């Protein structure tokens, strides 16, 4: 077994955010942790992006600090696999490196990883770092500049259940303040940390008792001094003999999860809350402290972190919803909100379910996820590519160029060109334009003029004009009537293409030395000659500007493009990179989308070039073939005119992205999704929270509360507290309007949904597996399977089947209904009397959470006993247990690759693949599935499904969605291919600088607490694709063994076209 994993969509949810002076002393930065990605911003007046890096680990801890005599702040990061590091920001010119000041692994092999997980704290005097990794221990990294491998000592903590810790301000020796739990209740203790005697001395105040659910500790800075303990009913201040205690009624009805210091002295603090409310915590000084106050600011999305920036701007980082930038206002709005959203950052959120549909009924798939939870939950329609919306398309053939023409604002005209002819449209020619003063330019097959010779190549801007007659060049300037000739030169070879985008320079492509050159203007002299190599001439050339940097672009006739870094004064060409895009010669052209200039490349793979991370990205236009193009305003405004081989077209263009995400808000948690094509609509399980009434109500309007048809369950089988109310939503495939909502019984959860046909019945049903859920019980002892048909307009209940457990999973199986009922797998048949009757079942489970099928085979993913393989023996009408993996993997998602190969995600962020052993002594060696591939993903996988986002060397294609919003892809490799990739996997590790100097082999190693094996049968496509973004000096370090660097570009490129 040989698999290749790669990322289709990087993780979107926010684990952490921190604010400080990281890039410079005078810059104010926002640092954001997504899972393995670290984002770095500068605060403007918005956010200017500077650097996004990736690490080889889940970032568990991230805080800035500044040692004595340090120019700017240093960054401390700790990963979940226990990699510690200190990073510095160094920007020596055009280049930016996150350089590793110190690094080390701080794991012990004796250890209970705790509830509340990792906690990472730094001392105010920056003398020390404190970690709580395991119960009863406390690890200490002493921060003198000598300790560069980050060697650490442990102190033993007699408190075996710690909730939160902080270092305090204003303490002689360094002092930790923490809330712990024994019986008796929860308490606050303080220890001082001796660095030289190495263990705990006793602290300032004595041990006080706090609230049963006291959960957060804020350390107030020195003007005040103590610690604030946040709990569910009360906020309290503690300092020695000082104790203030407010218990405001507002904060009762939801839990506070995050906080942030707003005013540096500590007078004001932001509080975030599980239902999305934002609070200000106000310390009123009198340098005593008289009172605490809580004021409600407004609603945000549900905050995982909070960070005040400058000037009333708060960044709200979410993991259950979109992240946002919001403005805090002195004055309330018309509804009492001091909060106002400025910007919103898409989080594909917890992906809890997804399916692949060819919605726009062409050949390209779209993902449709269940995203988010509570009021942030939504569907996301995810489409690959950049689409263009047609508004008119004249069926006109030929066409070898077009231009737009503007005396005020609007574009008005649109000029075409054909062999030797030229038609002009408002319903041969080289250029058409609007130039200085008045008049427009027009350049024909021969002359605007020279000495009976034919112009062969043209170029122009607002004020200057360069034409080429054979190898001769001329320099024209536009003056208040007709064009005065400036310069004259002859090139050593024939001119192929020409650009002068503004003008002190001139880009030129020549005919026999395959050259691209920069020439001074007017001098025409040669500032830089670059040999492109090869034996195909350039077809278009172009200089432009992407995100403040300058570039040269030269399309060759074989569809390759080159791009360099332009100087604009020196004219030097730097950092040659080469991108394949299509097979026929590309025509380059600039256009504007937002306030950015991009480039439209026209080949049989139309592409838009732009700049994301100050690197250039190439993204496909979802069009068959484009030959010419230009921007319009005349079809009408803000548009693109595009000619293909055999007709024209005009229209608008999508956001310039790799992925298009349409978002459908629901204001409740969606839980499962499935497409029913004959009804052209979607079934979505969702739940909403309602609260014990004065009699159950509903906190806000939701998708189920505002459907466009309702119904409520009819069934008489089972004859301020909160509670989930579940529904099946019917969702129009085109408008995504919620057509119908059916509500289930009180305390019934819908956990599983299918859309299938059954038996010889010609109807297509929605089938819902449910469970009766009471917090008292451990597992459910009652649930039901319900058979709905979407008739027209409304849902009617066709069948019902009571069962003795939760229906965790269901799947259509060969005309029958396979189901998991709470540690039993069962097979139902569909009678002519419209009824489910049992056929067989299987009880050798602990909790069958996950089913998938293929032919007569069934993959069963268990709560804790890993995976097992079942068969339906169709003659005997039975289940046959074929084999089983005998490892203690706690499953999250499961998928069948082929009939011999089964894929699985476990709750430790690992992937494995199981095979059928093809060995002798069948009865036991063939009853054991062998793990044949291991790989640490770093993500928790909720769903696999078969399908692909792409199609308008590898085999098969499985997408997966994760809690952190990353969408991933798995595919199969030939053995020829895996060994080659595995090879240059290890060559790339020797060359790629890893942030924190974490080793890639360690990162991807399979890791539980039972065992830690290295990864096998698995290729990290993220790592293989990083080959395209390194030096060519370092590329050649990676080609020592007949191979050439330009050859592996081809291989790695072909693999990027996979997602």
């Amino acid at each position: 077994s040989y698999n290749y994993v790669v990322t289709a969509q990087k993780p979107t949810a926010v684990n952490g955010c921190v604010t400080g002076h990281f890039t410079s002393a005078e810059d104010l930065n926002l640092l954001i942790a997504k899972n393995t990605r670290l984002e770095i911003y500068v605060v403007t007046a918005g956010l200017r992006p500077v650097k996004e890096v990736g690490m080889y680990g889940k970032i568990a801890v991230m805080e800035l600090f500044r040692p004595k005599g340090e120019s700017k702040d240093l960054l401390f990061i700790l990963t979940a696999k226990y990699n510690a590091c200190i990073l510095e920001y160094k920007q020596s010119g055009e280049s930016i490196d996150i350089i590793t000041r110190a690094h080390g692994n701080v794991q012990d092999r004796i250890g209970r990883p705790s509830e509340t997980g990792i906690i990472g704290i730094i001392d105010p005097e920056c003398r020390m770092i404190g970690l709580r990794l395991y119960d009863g221990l406390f690890k200490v990294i002493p921060l003198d500049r000598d300790n560069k491998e980050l060697k650490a000592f442990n102190i033993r903590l007699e408190e075996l259940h710690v909730i939160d810790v902080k270092f305090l301000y204003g303490c002689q020796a360094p002092t930790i303040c923490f809330v712990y739990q024994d019986p008796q209740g929860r308490h606050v203790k303080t220890y001082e940390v001796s660095l030289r005697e190495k263990e705990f001395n006793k602290g300032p105040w004595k041990q006080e008792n706090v609230e049963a659910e006291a959960s957060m500790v804020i350390a107030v800075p020195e003007p005040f001094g103590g610690a604030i303990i946040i709990g569910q009913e009360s906020i309290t201040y503690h300092n020695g003999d000082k104790y203030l205690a407010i218990a405001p009624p507002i904060i009762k009805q939801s839990t506070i999860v995050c906080h942030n210091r707003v005013d540096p002295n500590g007078s004001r603090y932001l509080l975030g809350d599980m239902e999305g409310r934002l609070f200000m915590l106000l310390l009123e000084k009198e340098v005593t402290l008289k009172d605490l106050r809580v004021e409600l600011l407004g609603e945000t999305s549900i905050a995982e972190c909070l960070t005040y920036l400058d000037n009333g701007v708060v960044f709200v980082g979410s993991r259950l919803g979109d992240s946002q930038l919001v403005k805090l206002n002195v004055d309330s709005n018309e509804q009492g909100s001091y909060v106002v959203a400025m910007e919103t950052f898409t989080n594909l959120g917890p992906i809890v379910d997804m399916c692949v549909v060819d919605l726009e009924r062409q050949g390209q798939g779209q993902l449709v996820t269940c995203s988010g939870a509570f009021k942030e939950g939504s569907l996301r329609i995810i489409r690959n590519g950049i689409g263009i919306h047609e508004h008119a398309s004249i069926d006109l053939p030929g066409i070898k160029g077009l231009w737009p023409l503007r005396n005020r604002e609007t574009d008005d005209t649109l000029v075409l060109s054909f062999v030797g002819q030229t038609r002009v449209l408002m319903l041969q020619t080289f250029f058409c334009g609007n130039v200085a003063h008045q008049q427009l330019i027009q350049i024909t097959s021969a002359s605007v003029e020279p000495q009976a010779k034919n112009i062969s190549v043209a170029s122009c801007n607002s004020s200057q004009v360069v034409v080429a007659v054979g190898r001769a060049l001329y320099y024209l300037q536009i003056h208040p009537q007709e064009l005065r000739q400036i310069s004259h030169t002859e090139m050593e070879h024939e001119v192929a293409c020409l650009d002068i985008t503004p003008s002190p320079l001139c880009a030129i492509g020549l005919w026999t030395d395959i050259s691209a050159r920069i020439l001074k203007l007017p001098s025409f002299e040669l500032l830089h000659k670059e040999m492109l190599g090869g034996e195909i001439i350039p077809r278009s050339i172009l200089m432009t500007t992407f995100e403040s940097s300058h570039y040269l672009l030269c399309a060759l006739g074989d569809g390759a493009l080159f791009y360099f870094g332009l100087n604009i004064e020196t004219g030097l060409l730097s950092d040659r990179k080469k991108v394949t895009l299509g097979t026929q010669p590309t025509v380059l052209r600039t256009f504007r989308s937002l306030s950015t200039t991009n480039v439209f490349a026209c080949s049989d793979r139309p592409t838009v070039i732009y700049s994301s991370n100050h690197k250039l990205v190439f993204s496909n236009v979802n069009l068959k073939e484009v030959n010419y193009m230009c921007p319009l305003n005349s079809g009408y405004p803000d548009s693109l005119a595009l000619a293909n081989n055999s007709t024209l077209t005009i229209g608008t263009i999508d956001e310039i992205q790799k992925l298009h995400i349409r978002t459908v808000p629901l204001y409740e948690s969606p839980r499962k999704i499935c497409y029913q094509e004959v009804s052209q609509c979607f079934g979505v399980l969702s739940s909403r929270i309602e609260v014990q009434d004065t009699s159950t109500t509903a906190l806000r309007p939701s998708a189920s509360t505002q459907a466009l048809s309702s119904s409520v369950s009819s069934s008489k089988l089972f004859s301020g507290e909160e509670v989930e109310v579940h529904n099946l939503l019917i969702i129009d495939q085109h408008t995504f309007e919620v057509l119908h909502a059916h509500q289930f019984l009180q305390n019934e959860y819908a956990l599983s949904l299918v859309s299938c046909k059954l038996g010889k019945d010609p109807n297509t049903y929605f089938i819902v597996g449910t469970a009766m859920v009471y917090p008292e019980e451990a597992e459910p002892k009652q649930g039901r399977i319900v058979v709905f048909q979407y008739s027209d307009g409304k849902l009617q209940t066709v069948a019902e089947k009571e069962v003795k457990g939760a229906v965790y999973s269901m799947v259509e199986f060969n005309g029958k209904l396979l189901a998991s009922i709470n540690s039993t797998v069962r097979l139902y048949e569909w009678t002519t009397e419209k009824e489910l009757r049992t056929e067989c079942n299987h009880y050798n489970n602990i909790m069958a959470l996950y089913l998938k099928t293929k032919g007569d085979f069934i993959l069963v993913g268990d709560l804790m006993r890993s995976v097992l393989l079942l068969a339906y023996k169709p003659m005997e009408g039975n289940f046959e247990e074929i084999a089983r993996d005998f490892n203690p993997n706690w499953m999250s998602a499961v998928e069948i690759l082929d009939d011999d190969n089964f894929l699985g995600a476990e709750n430790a962020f690992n992937l494995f693949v199981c095979q059928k052993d093809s060995a002798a002594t069948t009865d036991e060696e063939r009853q054991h599935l062998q793990e044949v591939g291991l790989f640490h993903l770093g993500e928790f996988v909720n769903v696999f499904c078969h399908g692909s986002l792409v199609m308008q060397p590898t085999q098969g294609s499985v997408l997966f969605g994760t809690v952190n919003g990353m969408i991933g892809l798995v595919t199969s490799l030939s053995e020829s291919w895996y060994n080659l990739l595995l090879d240059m996997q290890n060559r790339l590790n020797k060359v790629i600088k890893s942030v924190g100097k974490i080793e890639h082999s360690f990162w991807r190693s399979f890791h539980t607490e039972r065992k830690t094996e290295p990864a096998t049968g698995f290729i990290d496509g993220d790592l293989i694709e990083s080959f395209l973004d390194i030096s060519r000096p370092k590329m050649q370090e990676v080609v020592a063994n007949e191979a050439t660097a330009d050859d592996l570009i081809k291989v790695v490129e072909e693999l990027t076209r996979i997602h």
């Binding site: 917890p350 939870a373 469970a771 859920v773 917090p775 019980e777 597992e779 939760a806 909720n942």
Partner: peptide, 13 residues
């Protein structure tokens, strides 16, 4: 309760 624990875990709540 397993169902809620599971529902929570899928959120990683």
């Amino acid at each position: 309760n397993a169902v809620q624990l599971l529902c929570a875990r899928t959120r990683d709540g």
